[PDB]
Amino acid sequence: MNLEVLCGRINVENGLSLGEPGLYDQIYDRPGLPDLDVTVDATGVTVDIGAVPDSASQLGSSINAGLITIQLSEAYKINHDFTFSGLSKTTDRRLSEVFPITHDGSDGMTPAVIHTRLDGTIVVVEFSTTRSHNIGGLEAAYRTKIEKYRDPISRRVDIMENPRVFFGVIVVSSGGVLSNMPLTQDEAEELMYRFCIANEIYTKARSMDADIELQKSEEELEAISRALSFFSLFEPNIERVEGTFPNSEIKMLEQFLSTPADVDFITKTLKAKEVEAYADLCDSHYLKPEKTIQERLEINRCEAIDKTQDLLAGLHARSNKQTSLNRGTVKLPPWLPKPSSESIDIKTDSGFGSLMDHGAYGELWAKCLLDVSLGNVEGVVSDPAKELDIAISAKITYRRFKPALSSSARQEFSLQGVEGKKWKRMAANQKKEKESHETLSPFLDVEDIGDFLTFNNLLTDSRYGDESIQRAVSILLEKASAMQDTELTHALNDSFKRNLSSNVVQWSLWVSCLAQELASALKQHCRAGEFIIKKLKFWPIYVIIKPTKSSSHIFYSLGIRKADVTRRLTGRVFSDTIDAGEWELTEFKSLKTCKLTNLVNLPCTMLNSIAFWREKLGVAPWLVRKPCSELREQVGLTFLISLEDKSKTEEIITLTRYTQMEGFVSPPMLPKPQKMLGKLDGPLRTKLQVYLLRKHLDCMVRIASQPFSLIPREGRVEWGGTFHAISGRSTNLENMVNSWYIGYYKNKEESTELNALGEMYKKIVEMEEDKPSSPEFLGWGDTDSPKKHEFSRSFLRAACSSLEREIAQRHGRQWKQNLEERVLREIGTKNILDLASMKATSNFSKDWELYSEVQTKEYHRSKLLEKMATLIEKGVMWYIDAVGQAWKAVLDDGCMRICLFKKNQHGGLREIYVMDANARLVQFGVETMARCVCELSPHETVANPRLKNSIIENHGLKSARSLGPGSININSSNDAKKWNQGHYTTKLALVLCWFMPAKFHRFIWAAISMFRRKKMMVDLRFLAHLSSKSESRSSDPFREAMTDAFHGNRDVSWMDKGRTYIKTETGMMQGILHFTSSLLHSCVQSFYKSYFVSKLKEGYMGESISGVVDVIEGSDDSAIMISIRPKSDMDEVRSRFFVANLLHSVKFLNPLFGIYSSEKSTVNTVYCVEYNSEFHFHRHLVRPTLRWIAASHQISETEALASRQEDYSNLLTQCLEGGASFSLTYLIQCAQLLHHYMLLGLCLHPLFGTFMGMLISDPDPALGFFLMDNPAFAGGAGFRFNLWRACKTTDLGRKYAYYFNEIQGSVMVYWGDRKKYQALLNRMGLPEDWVEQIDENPGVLYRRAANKKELLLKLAEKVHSPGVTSSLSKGHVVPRVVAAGVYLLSRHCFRFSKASLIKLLMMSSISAMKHGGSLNPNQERMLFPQAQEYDRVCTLLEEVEHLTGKFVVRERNIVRSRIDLFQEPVDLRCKAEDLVSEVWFGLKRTKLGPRLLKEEWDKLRASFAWLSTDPSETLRDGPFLSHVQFRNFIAHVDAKSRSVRLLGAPVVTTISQVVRMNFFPGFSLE
RNA sequence: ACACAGAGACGCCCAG
RNA sequence: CUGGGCGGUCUUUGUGU
RNA sequence: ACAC
RNA sequence: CACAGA
Ligand SMILES: [Mg+2]
């Protein structure tokens, strides 16, 4: 630990060098903490020190024993003194010794230790310590130290003799170290250990006396005093709590904390559970008696075959037992008409008779065509002339007709649902309605799907390159890519245009246009017998539409002449059409609002799929080949999932992951993928579902027969024999892993019908009927064979003690006294305005409890800011002032008063719980306490987001350190089932009260007791229909149970008669107690870790195995990693058997804590582990790129045309950092461009040609023009970078220069006319002169509110914010946004800071002749603060502009790699908000002295020269009228750095290296 | 056609 | 069985990061 | 965008 | 004047 040795390995070159910083974790094991006795005297602070326990943990050599004194005047820096002693031997120096005198007042600063080497270099080191657990605090301290001295050093680096100076920073915390100096892990560990000692000393010293610390600010002192008074004076009426809520005796907590654990009971139970787990292992894995590996695999195959046949036979008995069907998976025709110019060519004039005698559809279509040919055509094709007139100078006219249909044709239509409510009592309708409820047989003949998936023609070229829609897209793309004109861009554009002419994309284009037509026509209405006829705009296809109500189905039938169908998609998966002579017709299918999204997004989805799988198979995006049939299978499967769009199919595909991860299990265990048949049964309703289930069962038996081969080709580990789960084709690991996520193409945002809420209610109440009768094992005593909800007190206390051990070992032996202070501070500092959010709250009370009184009323939810505004207007400012009344209200009730709804997710059947105001207020405090406690835990990853990347990676270094090279790693990924609903809440209350300072005990106990009488409100329409029918007659038991409970036949415990709600005592809810559940899981993991370590220490037969144990856990996911080191091949088998036994008993020990292990746990896999959808295959971290690629169209509604590109950029960056190469990301962006122009009206509006030809001359964002990125850096740089680079090459800054000098001498479209927002503002009653009031008192924008009026102004400003502006937007963004493409370029929709887009383009072009000058740098800074790094990066990317390179045999070492591409420039050291507030008001917000800040103030003056010390005079000089935008721009000017993390080989050279490598995998660009 | 181990939707409101 | 109306229409969006 |  | 910094 020597400063000379530290400095002797610094490669100083040229003048000042500022080497890149780096981070060190707490990787190595640390010994015990020595004894510390502290007595603080007026003479000084006297400390005695024991001795560090000597072991094979040499860490702790710098600590010496004996008595140490510290003076009282210097006792406020014990942390900084004691940590860095030993690196201090020659005192402190000034900026005068080795540096000259520049006569500026900066001569005199003392930078810790200044050292000059024998060569003559000068290296200055600076030290800092921080008590901040997150890495943000270390980053902040590092930055403030590196900005305190950089100017005084770069000032004198020019006077002296051609200097070579290095500036060094070392920042030390309890967690880690951030230093830009070279350093060793051991040096880091030593510094952190010393800091732990020093902080313990400081805490003990500051405890006894009270003058050691310096002065806390008045705001902090007030906050702590306020919270402490609240917790001293809070009395929650424990007698009433015991009377009201069940199992709420405080005696339970007292006895839990007083009675110790029963160690004899613990060890006896541990022996019993080990024996039971060993017996289960031998029985279920056929280990005894004495069979070989193939002889056991041959039995495993037989068992899997038996289970599969049993499941098939079970499902077949509940079907209609049919073996052939006539359904089709794709409900759309296979037509591929050639796109041509537009004219209504129906006048075949011979088809008007051949249609008339072909059936009901023939009659309908003949009537329609005859009426159109006789009559007018308005509505069928939109009129350009009148629309152009209205644009230059929104009810839309549609063509409606009433055919004279007969009763036979009407009945035949109604069989398909067209007007089937008035025909629902006939014979055929009732028969078909009964027959629609049956499920298919597992033995149905689905081979058309099997042939289609391999032998289609989806990827064939359609030869439709030179058509209208292709020409439009190509024109816009070339204009967008004109500025970055290079051979690279030309190659990628040519590849995209090749993919745009394939058969599937040509199909998806007209499918998407039809879906957009339906989305627009959803909101119309028709009378009885009315229909709507439409043409399809570049395609000769006619559609008849029957809308009902826009919240229900819409029916459509398609018609095309046979001469126009040039080509067809081949296959037998399509529904069959009607031949009517010269026409083809279709039989009235239907759609909904929620099922239109996939059809709108289909062309872009198919384009992305083609590009992605071509990249994954190794085909470069500039070569032309033939499809390899694996490409066909993957793309066809994507197609079929997208078009079918059903939850069951998505769920059958998703489960393949858990059956195929079972092939990584190593000996002595067998792969058992047959445990996933528990989730596989259920009703089958489509042929595609039958096919997928059969393929999945084949995959299961194949995996059970043979595991994945593990071969050491280099020392790195690679697996062989992998395959696609559905196709069965052999592949590699990455393609197999990505194949598990194909089901994510199904539309997540799915409408739930009222038919399917019983499943959610069933999942909620399935455990309540199981609650134990006696409360003995709910916290009082010990049991060894626990029931469903019970747990053992001794084991709970053992786990708590173990986690406390680890907490003390990391944070020192006074962690509780620091935790108390942190919790008091964070409770006292909060106000109501922090709570007031845009979030739903329940109105359910004791007025909606009786369905007799409810029927006429309609239940609605409110938003949280309404109730919070009520509180603020009452006279409540602080959260402490609100909890006291919220709890009293809750205790006056006896309920929790929840309402429910369903979540949209790619998972299962997740339900959502919504609370009310008082419940939210009470829960806030306990959640903040639990979060503060979880932030200390060293293996929890909810309060520590870096630990989910740190632990797994550092395990290898720790194992190498403690065992040497060549060690076997053995893992276990664990998942928990019924996580919520398995937890009784007394458990969480006890575990949280174990870790808290005993003044919070009563509040925590009373706050958590209220979860034991919940009342959840069911849906009123569901209740109406359930009350309509007295008897249930259903085969599912839950239906009749609910009916009889609500009507009073039987008695269940969760529903009363005539009520509107469901009661439940057991179980927490999903997400309400996130941190408490995480803390409990951390305690359990710590118990397992100590247990495994002790077991390894006393190995088999008494000999000791040497090993390393690592654990990690979140909320319900966890992982265990063990590394062993055996001596010989005889020892290896027995050590691995011992480890397998150790990892197998987790599922047997879990029930003791109230946790149940799921069937999705992959136990005993050697060189792999998965924790949170991240798959660590030895040294080949894999992510599923397909998950984020399938979500690159989920845009937001936005408000301005120029904020759509920001959303597209966010999605693109997600895709790139998910593991996509730059060329792939550029192709994804081409697809996003097509999506943007389609929502702007490409396939709807007739005037898009004129608008596009008039925009291609004036390429401006916010007039709809799309800006493309550079292919070499596709996703790295954002929209601001693209705008900056576009204003400097084409005529945009020219336009901006017109707009600038006209100011010195943005085209919003509203969606609802702000009706809901305006009504929300009307109920609040806020002052409308708030702008004037904050103009006359500006302290509200920088200083936290201090009275009711200022808090009112704070809220009033908050509720006019851009964030609050768009939150009343409901779901299904794509249909609602694409519906407005009908009235976009021709109606008065924009209010520029109303007119149509054509009109605004005309105004801008009329100003295009007065355009003057290009942009100037001084205000280029004002528009773009980061305008220097932009030029540096733009200049770096011009070396790569061609398509020359070589294919290299790729190395396989994949890791996250952070890239900083835009840094922070050299401005005033602080933030502008901080500095301005500091000078303008009395607020010590910035961290500089009194003589300081004058330099920063004068340097800030250079940018403006009008800014002054007075806010009032400052306001009247600048170009800003009001402080409300003054503050906005002050926050804006502080520029933000952009950083991106990547996937690739470990690594301004970084930018060039990633540009070279990650253009295409295995290709070295230039 | 959608939803569902048969709980729903297939238009609603007003005036005649 | 005639006429007139029906959109940011609610369903619908919880806790954390 | 991820989890619960 | 210069120090330390949840
Ligand atoms: Mg897991």
3D architecture notes:
Among the domains are: 3-214, no CATH class; 335-440 and 449-464 and 508-616, no CATH class; 1188-1436, no CATH class; 1445-1557, no CATH class. The strands form 12 sheets. Strands 10, 11, 12, 13, 15, 16 and 17 form a 7-stranded antiparallel β-sheet that branches. With 1566 residues, the protein is α+β, with helices and mostly antiparallel strands. Helix 16 crosses helix 22. The protein is 43% helix and 11% strand. The protein binds magnesium ion (MG). Residues 973, 975, 1117, 1170 line the site of magnesium ion. The chain binds 4 RNA strands through helix 2, helix 3, strand 17, helix 29 and strand 20. The PDB classes it as viral protein. The entry lists the keywords sftsv, RNA-dependent RNA polymerase, viral RNA, viral protein. The assembly is pentameric.
SSE diagram, text form:
Elements lengths: L2 H5 L14 E3 L11 E5 L4 E5 L16 E5 L7 H7 L28 E4 L5 E8 L5 H14 L1 H7 L8 E8 L4 E3 L5 H24 L9 H16 L4 H7 L5 H9 L4 H23 L7 H24 L18 E2 L14 H4 L5 H15 L9 H9 L6 E3 L5 H8 L12 H9 L12 H8 L12 H13 L6 H13 L3 H19 L9 E5 L6 E6 L6 E8 L5 E2 L9 E2 L3 E3 L3 E3 L5 H4 L1 H15 L13 H15 L2 H8 L1 H5 L26 H19 L3 E4 L4 E4 L12 H6 L19 H8 L27 H19 L3 H14 L3 H4 L4 E2 L9 H4 L7 E2 H11 L5 H13 L5 E5 L8 E4 L2 H18 L12 H17 L4 E10 L7 H10 L6 H9 L4 E4 L2 H9 L8 H11 L13 E4 L9 H24 L9 E7 L3 E8 L4 H16 L1 H4 L6 E2 L4 E4 L2 E3 L4 E3 L7 H5 L14 H14 L4 H18 L8 H8 L23 H8 L6 H12 ...
Parallel strand pairs: 6-7, 22-25
Antiparallel strand pairs: 1-8, 2-3, 3-4, 5-6, 7-8, 9-14, 10-11, 11-12, 12-13, 13-16, 13-17, 15-16, 18-19, 20-21, 22-23, 24-28, 24-29, 24-30, 25-26, 27-28, 31-32, 33-34, 35-38, 36-37
Helix pairs in contact: 2-5, 6-29, 10-25, 12-14, 16-22, 19-21, 19-53, 21-22, 21-45, 23-25, 28-40, 29-34, 33-34, 34-40, 36-37, 36-40, 44-45
The chain binds 4 RNA strands through helix 2, helix 3, strand 17, helix 29 and strand 20.
